[model samples]
Target: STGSATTTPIDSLDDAYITPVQIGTPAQTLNLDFDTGSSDLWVFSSETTASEVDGQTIYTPSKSTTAKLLSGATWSISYGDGSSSSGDVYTDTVSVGGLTVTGQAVESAKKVSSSFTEDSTIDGLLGLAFSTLNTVSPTQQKTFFDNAKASLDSPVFTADLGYHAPGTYNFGFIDTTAYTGSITYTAVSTKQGFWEWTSTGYAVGSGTFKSTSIDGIADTGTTLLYLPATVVSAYWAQVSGAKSSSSVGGYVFPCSATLPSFTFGVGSARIVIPGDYIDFGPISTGSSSCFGGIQSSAGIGINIFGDVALKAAFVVFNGATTPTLGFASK
Candidate 1:
């Protein structure tokens, strides 16, 4: 049978989406961030120190009779935003929506960075990237999708990230009715353990489309779009008062600035990110300065098509041979 889950954005930040997942027997439910950028299912659990656990829910493995400890196994993960978690391992039954996988490796966090500890809403992370990126030591673990793919009618999933709204994530099946127009397909490289693809070029506002090839990863966990320095500069140049702020660490402009649409070319199809989406809230509460949703991926060699860009289009993460990415206008 096919499985699906609804993803809801955080009410405060709207930076990442969380989905409910069942772990172990007796089915303890945890609200997890479904991150396409990493591959590891980790949760705050009994192993976590009480001081470390703030308002976040903890998964008590002792309550599940089917939970088994993976002796000597441990996992540690760090994200691009500096958030991190490390913990012991437990093998248990895990389920996402209606799909179930037996003996899935569930990392129970004993420690977490402030980035995660302070975010009381996110109890854990459900990684959707390739199995190769799993961090469990001794033996890397496969993701929930990899473990359940053979039972699926088709090996595919789709991410429908809405702008400050709830969206759906489909596993083992595609809901054609969720999007409009035809789906444009492009090749993806899994060599980097990410859904990395290349865009033929892009255009800012109504300007001319450049022919430069842009390589980037489609990441659901990331909040902003990160492009090359030159590309970011070109886009900001169109905004009269836009300036890169050292204190803020990204481009900021007046909240009332009339921004232009940013478009990226996927093969022959062009996915456009509306100007309004570029205004990522304000730099600070009650402040007129707003941070740009698109930033420069200066130190990071590759671009990252984060939520700001993904929410603008319907995306299909095809796990079939060669791993293709299919996109359509929402």
Candidate 2:
């Protein structure tokens, strides 16, 4: 169902994390950050707090020569943006991309907070989205495809996000020729993964938003794509002159040609929002430059499909049939 994985350029410090395949059979190496909004996998130990885990990457089961540590289960996590972590369960021999799985099950946080040890550079987060929001096993049990799901080949898993590009995040098998075929899915309405469908209002530069129905959620760990402040003031009141630059989180239409191109109707999929992502500049000081990746979130219930709608679609997350979240092609 969800198929499209190919992103490269991740070494903010050791390949932007995202490395987890280890799950039984002499394999153990865990480092992840794949959160599709929620579903979970975690790591960061050494009892955390060298200043709340400065710079991330903790894992030190007595210096891993290859995983070890399930001392007896105990892990915690809390994120809705509030950020939180707790730890204890470990069982390593983990390694991903190089393929290795053994004993798996890792959640080594040992208490963290600085609102999640500040800005998170990636040290933990491998939630391929869909386990009904697994908070690192709360009895729901069944995290990383319950043992690599027999080595996955078709249940699919691909998320090639290229902010800078270099295997930004890659797993196994899903190369349907880089997709151009057909990949669109929408049927998760228990109010979970937030792709609720129906958003018919929003436009700038070309102006359009006469209350066209709206619901949301496609979040890929949020990076900007939140809509509903009356469709962001009716799509920035038709951009041609678009003003309203308190600037920094969304709503700054000032020449990217003031923004254009829009579509959003998830029930059957119509998702579109690329106009240089609506003015996002200014990286610092009083900040009001706009467009580092769009910005706007007042509709506040849930509607995140971040990575800019998964870099234009191709998402598959099928935990070997049990948790199920499959969307194909790409």
Candidate 3:
């Protein structure tokens, strides 16, 4: 019951994180973002108006003989910032990696916000969070991970996200050759529909480790790392020319500046994010100011250990009755 799959950056800038998802009877494959932060496997589909689709590949349920509409079932997810999509539901055969699950809920979009329409590479989201967070009313639906967990070899899945290359998402088994050292395991709280856990603190470069608890969620969907204000401030303080600016909405520094590394604790294990990873990119073409990958979470409320950090380690999203997170460095 074990399966494995490949995931890669859809674009050159790592702006789109997606996996090849095969759907329907004929197996119409679409690139869908595997997001652990949310629980809804919604996709751009034939149901979506042509005017709303830019360059995304939509799922035409009509072509899939195995696809069946879930009567009266509708779903809507909101980012609360006006970006959202509402759609109808369908049950069809969905395959990830090499594992196949029949009757998986395949949400088909009816309408999407401009932000979604504008992003040509991101077709939709495949949420891996607990099923409780599914937006489907009338009857809730299970995530691909949850539905496949019962048959998984170990009731677990591992994420080995790479910086510029495709990563491996192994199900029901750990790829022992992928990571170095023993994996550090920690408890996860699903109350927030996230793989949220308390981190053991952080350090700026070679500085001393501050062993305080930092509550955050491990979200591959998020692009940047958001930490406590104090930790963020400490990180930037080391940079020669860095400051928090409202103009850009985050801390920015000269692209030429030699940035220091950032390290976060997972139990007693430490994951170091190279300075290059934090240097997101110049604010503009040929610009001197570069936006940082790490930012203050003063207003965000929750500290997000996003791809900026996740890509630096090996993470296991354990789906046992009582879930736990495993972290390790390669």
Candidate 4:
């Protein structure tokens, strides 16, 4: 069968995308970051320590009869930026957009780092990456997608994230009308527990397309597009008054500067990100300096084609025996 869920930008510039989810006996609704970069389906819950709980919604498992403690099971995850979360585990009936998965592992956050606790935009996250990366200890658990894959009409899910608008997450089948042109398929490497693939090349704005391999993951959770310094510097060089500022933590340009679009290739298909998306607004409310949506991932070890790039195309994560990623202009 197929199901559809609406995903909207959490804040300006799409810091994170949030999808509505339902849990508990009363069928309470909570917003979740439908992350393709992570593998743990975790949420802020009643079990979350009060100090770490801000204005975010919490899922109270005790209110749901279907909830059963996964005794002795625990999980902890750390991100590159030091953001971390540790929690207990529970098995419950989880529903997304009309699709239901029974006995799905729902990690209830017991503690969260300041980076997560202070952000009130998301209630928690539901990971769509390969289940092998799940953080649970002792016994591992499958992600919602992995459990629901077999029952779906097709073992695939598509992400159609929009810029400053509501988009859709379609499971089981590709929505032909959601994208333009034929799709370009590329083999995926899940060895690193990510939808990692090598991009054919890139073009700085309207410049000539560079022929080279740029390997990275299609991460919806990450906000910016990160590439090698060579590419990032080239893109920014086109914009006058643009510079990599240590104080700002990234490349920033004058708001008055005209920004150029960025293009990345998925096989032979090219997806162009509008210059407006790259502006990323000003560094501060009244600041004339604007932050860039694309930055250098040199020191990070891995490049990431995050929301800045994903929103420009319709992406399909084909979780078949031989996994492949499909990209199409939207």
Best candidate, lDDT: 4
Candidate 1: where are CA atoms >4 Å away? none
Query: What's the TM-score of every candidate structure?
Result: 0.97, 0.33, 0.97, 0.98
TM accuracy, model 2: 0.33
- State the C-alpha lDDT per candidate: 0.91, 0.53, 0.90, 0.92
lDDT of 4 by residue, 1-330 (tens): 888999999887788889998886778688999989989989999999999999999999999988999999999998766799999999988888888888999999999999888889899989998999999999999999999999999999999999999999988999999999899999999999999999999898789999899999999888899999999999999999999999999999999988899989888879899998887888999999999999999899999989999999999999999999999998
Question: Candidate 1 or 4, higher lDDT?
Answer: 4
- Report the lDDT tens digits of candidate 1 across residue range 176-294: 89998889999999999999999888999999999889999999988999999999999999998999999999999999898899999999889999998888768999999989989
In model 1, what is the error at residue 225, expressed in angstroms?
Answer: 0.4
In model 4, how large is the Cα lDDT of residue 297? 99
Estimate the TM-score for candidate 4. 0.98
Evaluate candidate 4 by giving its C-alpha RMSD to the native, one decimal. Answer: 0.9
- Where model 3 places Cα greater than 4 Å from the true spot, the runs are 80-82
List where candidate 2 sits over 4 angstroms from the true fold: 1-57, 63-90, 93-102, 105-122, 127-143, 146-222, 225-237, 240-263, 267-282, 295-330
Per-residue CA lDDT of model 3 for 60-135, tens digit only, reads 9999999999999999998623589999999999998789999999999999999999988888999987889999
Candidate 4 wrongly placed segments (more than 4 Å): none
Clashes of each: 0, 53, 0, 0
